[PDB]
Amino acid sequence: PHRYRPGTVALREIRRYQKSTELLIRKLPFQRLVREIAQDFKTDLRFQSSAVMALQEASEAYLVALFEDTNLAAIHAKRVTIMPKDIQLARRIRGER
Amino acid sequence: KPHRYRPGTVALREIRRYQKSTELLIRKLPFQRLVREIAQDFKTDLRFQSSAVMALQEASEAYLVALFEDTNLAAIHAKRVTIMPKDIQLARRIRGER
Amino acid sequence: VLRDNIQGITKPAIRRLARRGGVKRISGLIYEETRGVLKVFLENVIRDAVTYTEHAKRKTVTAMDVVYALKRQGRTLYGFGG
Amino acid sequence: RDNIQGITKPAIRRLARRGGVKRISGLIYEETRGVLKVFLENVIRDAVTYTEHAKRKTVTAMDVVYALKRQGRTLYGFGG
Amino acid sequence: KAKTRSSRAGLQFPVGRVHRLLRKGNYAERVGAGAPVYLAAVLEYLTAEILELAGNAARDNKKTRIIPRHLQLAVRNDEELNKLLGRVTIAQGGVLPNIQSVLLPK
Amino acid sequence: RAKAKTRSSRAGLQFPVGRVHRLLRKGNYAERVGAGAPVYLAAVLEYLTAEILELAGNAARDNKKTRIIPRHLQLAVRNDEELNKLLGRVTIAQGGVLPNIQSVLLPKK
Amino acid sequence: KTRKESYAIYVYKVLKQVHPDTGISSKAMSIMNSFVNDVFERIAGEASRLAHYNKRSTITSREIQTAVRLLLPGELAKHAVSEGTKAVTKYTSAK
Amino acid sequence: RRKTRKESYAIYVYKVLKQVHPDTGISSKAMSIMNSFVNDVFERIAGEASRLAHYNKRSTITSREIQTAVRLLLPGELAKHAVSEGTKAVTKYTSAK
DNA sequence: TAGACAGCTCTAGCACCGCTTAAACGCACGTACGCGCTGTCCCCCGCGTTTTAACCGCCAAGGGGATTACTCCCTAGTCTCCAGGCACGTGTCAGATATATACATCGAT
DNA sequence: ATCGATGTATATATCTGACACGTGCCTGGAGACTAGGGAGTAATCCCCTTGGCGGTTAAAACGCGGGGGACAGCGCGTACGTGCGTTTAAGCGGTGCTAGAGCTGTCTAC
C-alpha cells in the first residue's frame, strides 16, 4: 500500500508537537517515578498534584532544551541522527556535566 | 638542513607551558586602550583604577579560555582538530549567549 | 517501596520530547541517555524540594517547595506560585 | 578604533593554547575579537552604570566585581 | 476624602502595596517616597508590554482570551523579553515552531 | 563583672562569632537573628576554609613551595570535584587553568 | 486569613487598558502574577545591593533607576526610566 | 587624616591555615582571594537563610535556617560535614555561657 | 514576642476498583544515513627575518575621591478611618467538539 | 506532470465551563502630626590617575615552505524509520479514608 518516506512524518511530528502545548510524558509513570525518587531522601512522603505537574513541566522543558542543543550539535556534526555523545557534549558545554 | 619540528609538536608543547603558567596572555596596554575605548561609548571623561582594568583583563581571559575549551570540545566532537568560528557559534548558542 | 518506574518513561514519550525538541532522527542509546539525564535533574530538584520541606517540618511536598527548588538552580518555572 | 586589533593574533593564539586548542583557523582571531568586544561591552556597561550610581568619575575594581557577579561569573581577591 | 497614590503617580499598580512589600521585604531600613512609584511604573510597563504582545499573539491565533501558548510566543519572539527571561520556563507554553534547515527535505 | 570571654572561644571556633552576628544583623537578612545562627555559620565557614587551605597546602607541597599562591588555590579548587561544583561559576585570579590535554591531540605512533 | 495577596485586578485592568476586547485564562493569570512577583524580587534585590554598596540606608528612585538600567534590556530600561521619572514627577507635582 | 579601619578575615584564615598546615605560608593576593571566598559564601548562605525565613514566615534566623542553607547550597558530603561541624560548635557553645 | 507547642478542623492526598481505549509494544522491512575509505589541496604551522610598540621607569600635576562639618528635610512613627481590595456568588459566553468542505502537499506513476 | 490520497484550514452548529461581573466585607491604604537623622552640601586634602619622555627589548608582524588536515566523493550496511497487530496500562470515574495541612490559642524561652 502507501508508505511514507523516512523522515517526513518525523518532520510532521516535529511540527505537530511544536505547535502543541500538552505534556508528552504519561502522568502516572512520571508520578510513580517522582515517588520512587523522593522515597530515598525521606520515607512516607506526600505530594500535591500541583507539585507533580510542576516537576513534570520542569523536566519536559529541560529535556526539550537538551534535545534542541543536541540537534544543533548533531547538525553541527554534519549529521541528522543524534548521538549520545552529542548529549554529553551539550551537557559539558552547558556546565552541568 | 635546519632542524624543523613537525606541525603539532610545538603547538602541544606551548599548550603545555601555558597550561602550567598563570600570567596574562594579552599585552596590557592594548587591552587598556580597548577597555577605555569601549567605556567612552557610555560615559565621557572616564577614569580607571589599575586594579579595575586588571580585574577586567583576568575575567575576560578566563571567560574566553573557557570558551576556547568548549570550542575545541565541539570541534573534536565534529571529528576535527582545527577550530572554525562555527564552533564558537555553537558553543555560545548551547551556552545561551546568542 | 516503588521500584523501576524509569521504564515507565517509555520510548514514545522520549521520541515526542525529541520531536518537540526539534530532533528529526534518533539513535538507540539516546533513550537511556535521556533517562539518565532525567535521573540527574530529578534527583537534584527533588532533593532540594525535600530539603525545603524538611525546613518547614512538613510531610507533604508542596508546589511552592518545587518552585523554590527550581529557583535555587536558576531554572525557574511559572504558573505555580510566585 | 584600532584598539580591538590591539588584541593581537599571537595573543589570541596564546589564549587558545591555554584553552587546549591544537589548530586555529584565520577567522578565529576576528571571531574572538568580536566575542571579547561584546563581552567587554556588557561588563563595562554594567560597571559604568555602577560607577554612575556612585556619582564617581573613575571606575573602581569594586564596581568591576559587582558587575561581573551580576553577569554570573564572580572574581576572587579584587573586592567583595 | 482619601485618594490613592496610584492615581497621583498616574499609574495603575498599587503604590501602597508596593511600598508595604518593600518595607517588609527587608531590603533597607528606610524606603524613599518616590521609589515605590518608580517600582509600580516599571512593573506596570513590563506588564503592559507582555500583555500587548500576548494580545497580538492571541489575535494571530484568532483568540480573544490570552492562553499560556500566546505567552510563550510573546516571550520567545521579542528579543528583549527573551533576553530578560532567558533562564525562564513557562508551564504549558510549548516551544517556538522552529525547524532546522538541514532537516528540511531536499 | 566577670571576665570577658569571646563567643568564638566558647564555641571552639577561630572565626569571629560576634563579627558574623554583626554582619548578619546589618546585612538586612532578618529582623531577628538567633544565638545559634552565627556560631553555626562561623563553624561552616571555618570548615570550608580549613578544607580549601589544607588542599592548597597539599598543592604547595606538590609545587614545593611554602607559601600558597593563587595557582595553588586554583589547583585545590579544581582537583576536588565538590569544591569545583561549589565554585563552578567562580573565576580565580591568575590561578590559571588545569593542565589538561585531550587524547586525540596527543601524537600517535 | 483566607484572603490572598495577588496582583490579579491590576494585571486585568492593565489588559483592559491595552486591549479592551480580550479575555485572560486562569493559568495565564497565575503566570502574570509569576512575572510580576519575581521581577519584583530581582529589581528589589538589585536595589538592596545597590544601597548596600554605597553604604546608603534608604531606597530612592536613583537606586532602582540604576537597577532597571542594569537588569532590563536597553530599550526596556530606557522606556522604564523615562516613564518612571514621569510618574515620579506627576506624583510630586500632585504631592 | 588617619585611614579608617578596613575589615578582613585575614587573621582568622591565617589561624586556620596554621591549624591545617603549621609550616605553610600564604601570599597577600591569596589571603585576598580567600577573604573574597569567605565573604561570598557567607553572603550565599545568609541570603539562602533569609529567603528560607521569608518562605516559612519566620522572623528569626536561627541555626536551623543556616543548616537548611548548608543542606541546599553545598554538595552532599560538604554539606554533611558542615552540618556536623556546625552542630558540634552549636552544642558546645550552648554548653558554654 | 515570637515561635514552640497543643489542639482542633477538615482538607486533600492517597488508595482502590473497573471499564475503556489509546497509547505503548512487539515486529516486519527496506533504505537512508552513519561511517569508513580515498583523494585532494590548501592553508595553517613552523621558523627566520623584520618591525614596533609594549614595557618600565621616572616625573608632574590636578582632580577627584575620600574626609569632615553642618543642616534640613525627608522618612519613620503613630493613629484614625475609610475605601480599596478581596472570597464568594452568578451567569453567560468563548472555546471545545463535531460535521462538512475546500485545499495544498506528498508520492507513486 | 499528475492524480490520488491525505492531512489541514475553514465554516457552521451544540454545548459548558470557565471567566467576566456583582456583593459584601475588612483591612489595608490614606490622611494628619510627630521626631530625627540621614543625606545633601560645602570645605579640605591628597593621592593616584593621567600624561609625557626615553629606551629597549620583547613581542608582533611578515615571508614562506609544506604538510596534513579539512573536505569532497564514494561505497556500504545497518540501524532507524515506517507500517501492522497486539496489548498494556494510562486514563477516567467513583468510592474510602485519613493523614495532615491549616488555623488558633498559650506562653515562655528568647
Side-chain angles (χ1 to χ4, degrees):
Chain A
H2 181 276
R3 177 177 288 269
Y4 275 110
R5 299 290 68 58
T8 181
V9 311
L11 286 156
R12 184 174 65 242
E13 280 170 36
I14 283 177
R15 294 192 174 89
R16 267 51 153 179
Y17 292 131
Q18 278 188 348
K19 267 77 171 176
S20 71
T21 287
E22 69 270 19
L23 298 190
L24 311 164
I25 306 174
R26 298 293 99 199
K27 272 81 70 177
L28 212 52
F30 192 84
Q31 174 167 237
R32 284 197 312 274
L33 173 71
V34 175
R35 300 282 162 81
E36 70 178 2
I37 284 164
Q39 76 192 354
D40 293 331
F41 304 130
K42 65 178 73 175
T43 58
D44 190 53
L45 261 174
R46 281 179 183 257
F47 274 79
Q48 299 193 344
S49 51
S50 52
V52 176
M53 283 74 75
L55 280 163
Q56 187 155 6
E57 285 270 357
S59 303
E60 291 199 1
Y62 167 76
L63 280 181
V64 298
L66 186 65
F67 291 107
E68 60 88 18
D69 283 335
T70 302
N71 195 229
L72 279 174
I75 292 154
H76 179 264
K78 282 144 34 167
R79 279 186 281 101
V80 294
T81 301
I82 50 162
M83 294 298 102
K85 51 156 168 286
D86 302 322
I87 293 191
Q88 289 141 34
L89 178 84
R91 291 195 69 229
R92 167 71 175 81
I93 291 186
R94 276 154 87 82
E96 61 187 1
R97 179 184 295 261
Chain B
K1 40 200 177 292
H3 182 87
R4 169 174 273 258
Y5 289 112
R6 297 299 96 197
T9 298
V10 193
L12 280 162
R13 187 176 64 245
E14 60 86 19
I15 278 179
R16 190 175 62 85
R17 45 190 151 280
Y18 293 5
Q19 280 187 345
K20 292 189 297 294
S21 69
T22 59
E23 293 83 3
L24 294 179
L25 307 177
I26 307 174
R27 305 292 158 261
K28 72 212 185 307
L29 259 66
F31 195 86
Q32 183 63 255
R33 282 193 310 263
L34 171 65
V35 168
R36 293 184 184 177
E37 181 204 289
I38 285 174
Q40 188 65 23
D41 301 348
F42 306 118
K43 183 178 183 294
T44 47
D45 201 1
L46 268 174
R47 293 160 80 89
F48 277 82
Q49 286 188 341
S50 298
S51 52
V53 190
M54 186 66 204
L56 294 174
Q57 194 162 357
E58 57 205 59
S60 303
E61 279 210 4
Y63 157 72
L64 61 83
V65 168
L67 185 75
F68 269 128
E69 179 68 30
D70 295 341
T71 297
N72 196 3
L73 274 172
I76 290 170
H77 187 74
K79 294 185 285 186
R80 272 188 288 106
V81 165
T82 306
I83 50 157
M84 283 73 74
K86 55 151 160 283
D87 293 331
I88 287 186
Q89 291 151 9
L90 181 75
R92 298 191 69 220
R93 166 69 184 79
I94 298 191
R95 270 159 64 154
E97 310 179 18
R98 295 160 95 243
Chain C
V1 175
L2 271 69
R3 185 181 67 253
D4 196 40
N5 300 296
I6 186 55
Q7 301 313 317
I9 312 301
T10 57
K11 167 173 136 189
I14 306 178
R15 76 173 174 81
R16 282 191 293 268
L17 287 159
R19 295 297 188 256
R20 185 170 286 181
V23 167
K24 182 177 178 179
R25 192 163 148 108
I26 313 165
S27 164
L29 196 148
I30 286 296
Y31 294 99
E32 295 68 20
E33 190 82 358
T34 61
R35 280 180 189 110
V37 174
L38 169 70
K39 298 288 94 176
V40 163
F41 171 80
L42 269 184
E43 291 292 329
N44 292 347
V45 175
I46 281 175
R47 183 195 312 115
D48 271 15
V50 168
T51 303
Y52 269 114
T53 298
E54 268 175 322
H55 185 247
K57 280 162 307 178
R58 277 186 280 106
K59 292 184 271 323
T60 305
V61 176
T62 317
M64 61 80 71
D65 284 353
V66 178
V67 65
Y68 297 150
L70 292 170
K71 185 180 287 294
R72 185 256 171 272
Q73 320 171 349
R75 296 164 182 294
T76 187
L77 163 74
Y78 285 2
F80 301 93
Chain D
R1 313 159 182 168
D2 186 74
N3 306 302
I4 184 55
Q5 307 305 129
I7 313 301
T8 71
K9 171 205 168 178
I12 298 157
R13 291 174 69 76
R14 286 191 293 271
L15 289 156
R17 296 294 181 256
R18 183 161 280 174
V21 177
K22 195 159 164 81
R23 205 156 177 272
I24 304 167
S25 176
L27 285 79
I28 285 294
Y29 313 121
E30 271 302 320
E31 181 84 22
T32 50
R33 281 187 191 92
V35 167
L36 170 65
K37 183 180 183 294
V38 296
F39 171 81
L40 270 187
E41 287 288 328
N42 301 340
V43 180
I44 286 166
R45 182 199 308 115
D46 283 4
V48 169
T49 303
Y50 276 116
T51 290
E52 289 180 353
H53 184 243
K55 298 183 178 70
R56 280 189 272 95
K57 292 185 175 67
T58 197
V59 185
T60 69
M62 284 73 74
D63 296 349
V64 172
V65 164
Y66 303 154
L68 278 161
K69 76 179 190 296
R70 178 193 167 279
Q71 291 296 113
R73 61 183 67 252
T74 187
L75 181 55
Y76 282 0
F78 268 90
Chain E
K1 196 55 172 58
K3 187 158 65 176
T4 186
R5 277 191 274 171
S6 294
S7 69
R8 302 276 59 68
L11 306 170
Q12 302 300 277
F13 274 16
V15 178
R17 188 191 293 208
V18 162
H19 198 178
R20 182 206 67 199
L21 285 195
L22 278 177
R23 275 187 266 93
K24 72 98 175 179
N26 193 13
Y27 300 107
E29 69 182 3
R30 297 162 103 254
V31 174
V37 166
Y38 192 84
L39 282 72
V42 168
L43 294 182
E44 185 198 283
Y45 164 70
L46 291 182
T47 300
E49 289 293 325
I50 190 59
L51 281 180
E52 181 180 2
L53 301 183
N56 297 344
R59 291 184 293 112
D60 298 349
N61 299 25
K62 61 181 68 63
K63 294 292 181 69
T64 176
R65 188 166 286 167
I66 301 186
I67 68 167
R69 181 80 195 91
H70 309 144
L71 300 179
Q72 178 83 305
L73 289 173
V75 164
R76 302 313 167 192
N77 275 322
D78 196 357
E79 68 275 14
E80 309 285 78
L81 304 156
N82 190 26
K83 290 192 290 182
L84 184 63
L85 310 163
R87 285 88 151 94
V88 163
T89 297
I90 295 93
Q92 284 298 84
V95 306
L96 283 188
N98 63 6
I99 303 169
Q100 293 295 318
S101 292
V102 167
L103 312 177
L104 277 296
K106 72 196 170 66
Chain F
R1 203 209 186 191
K3 189 58 191 168
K5 188 183 285 185
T6 56
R7 277 188 270 181
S8 314
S9 65
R10 284 183 184 121
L13 305 177
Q14 316 297 319
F15 271 61
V17 170
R19 175 178 299 179
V20 164
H21 190 230
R22 182 206 80 218
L23 285 177
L24 277 170
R25 281 187 282 104
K26 276 74 69 177
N28 282 311
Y29 294 100
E31 190 276 331
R32 291 149 56 82
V33 175
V39 176
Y40 188 86
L41 182 60
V44 170
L45 288 179
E46 181 176 357
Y47 155 75
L48 291 182
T49 316
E51 203 169 332
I52 293 173
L53 277 176
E54 183 178 1
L55 292 188
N58 295 353
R61 297 284 74 78
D62 292 329
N63 204 3
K64 279 160 298 280
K65 291 296 191 63
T66 63
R67 281 174 202 154
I68 289 165
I69 54 166
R71 172 60 167 181
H72 299 148
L73 300 170
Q74 179 87 264
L75 292 178
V77 164
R78 302 310 163 192
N79 63 4
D80 204 62
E81 295 293 328
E82 294 180 354
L83 293 162
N84 175 38
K85 199 180 319 161
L86 166 70
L87 306 186
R89 300 300 277 122
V90 164
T91 181
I92 281 177
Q94 60 267 6
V97 304
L98 278 193
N100 45 359
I101 303 181
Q102 52 254 50
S103 54
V104 74
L105 311 178
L106 300 181
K108 300 289 94 175
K109 271 76 58 184
Chain G
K1 191 177 186 293
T2 300
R3 294 164 62 265
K4 297 293 187 291
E5 203 74 27
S6 82
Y7 290 91
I9 54 169
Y10 315 110
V11 64
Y12 177 75
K13 78 185 194 301
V14 164
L15 178 53
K16 296 290 105 178
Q17 269 203 2
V18 172
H19 289 117
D21 55 317
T22 309
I24 190 167
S25 176
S26 62
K27 300 299 300 308
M29 182 76 157
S30 167
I31 285 174
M32 295 298 102
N33 311 260
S34 80
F35 291 169
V36 170
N37 283 304
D38 45 17
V39 306
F40 182 76
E41 292 85 5
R42 281 82 58 85
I43 299 297
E46 199 41 63
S48 72
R49 44 191 280 121
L50 272 163
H52 195 262
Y53 297 156
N54 304 114
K55 318 290 165 34
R56 292 283 178 122
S57 67
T58 177
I59 309 285
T60 72
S61 54
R62 272 186 54 82
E63 281 80 13
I64 181 172
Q65 184 162 5
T66 298
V68 159
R69 273 167 170 146
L70 283 161
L71 288 176
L72 297 201
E75 63 95 16
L76 294 174
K78 182 178 184 292
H79 288 142
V81 170
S82 71
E83 67 193 306
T85 53
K86 167 189 52 167
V88 163
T89 299
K90 185 176 183 293
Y91 180 92
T92 50
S93 66
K95 182 175 73 175
Chain H
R1 301 190 191 101
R2 179 65 181 270
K3 308 176 182 65
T4 52
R5 270 192 170 67
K6 175 43 211 173
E7 191 272 329
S8 69
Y9 297 95
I11 58 182
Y12 320 108
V13 164
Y14 201 93
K15 286 181 211 173
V16 174
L17 175 63
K18 298 287 99 176
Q19 196 270 332
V20 304
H21 284 298
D23 62 358
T24 306
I26 197 64
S27 67
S28 293
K29 176 34 161 163
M31 42 195 98
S32 187
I33 282 175
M34 294 298 102
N35 185 66
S36 292
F37 167 77
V38 165
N39 274 293
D40 296 321
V41 164
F42 163 81
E43 195 272 332
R44 284 153 91 176
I45 297 177
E48 188 45 75
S50 184
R51 283 186 288 115
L52 273 155
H54 190 248
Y55 295 158
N56 313 132
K57 68 181 178 67
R58 298 299 198 72
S59 66
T60 309
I61 284 187
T62 63
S63 64
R64 183 176 177 86
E65 288 81 3
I66 310 293
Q67 176 167 181
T68 300
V70 174
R71 282 181 208 284
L72 282 176
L73 307 168
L74 292 175
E77 194 72 32
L78 294 185
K80 187 179 294 295
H81 286 143
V83 170
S84 69
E85 293 298 305
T87 298
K88 64 90 176 179
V90 162
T91 52
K92 73 184 297 299
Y93 170 79
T94 298
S95 71
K97 186 263 288 181

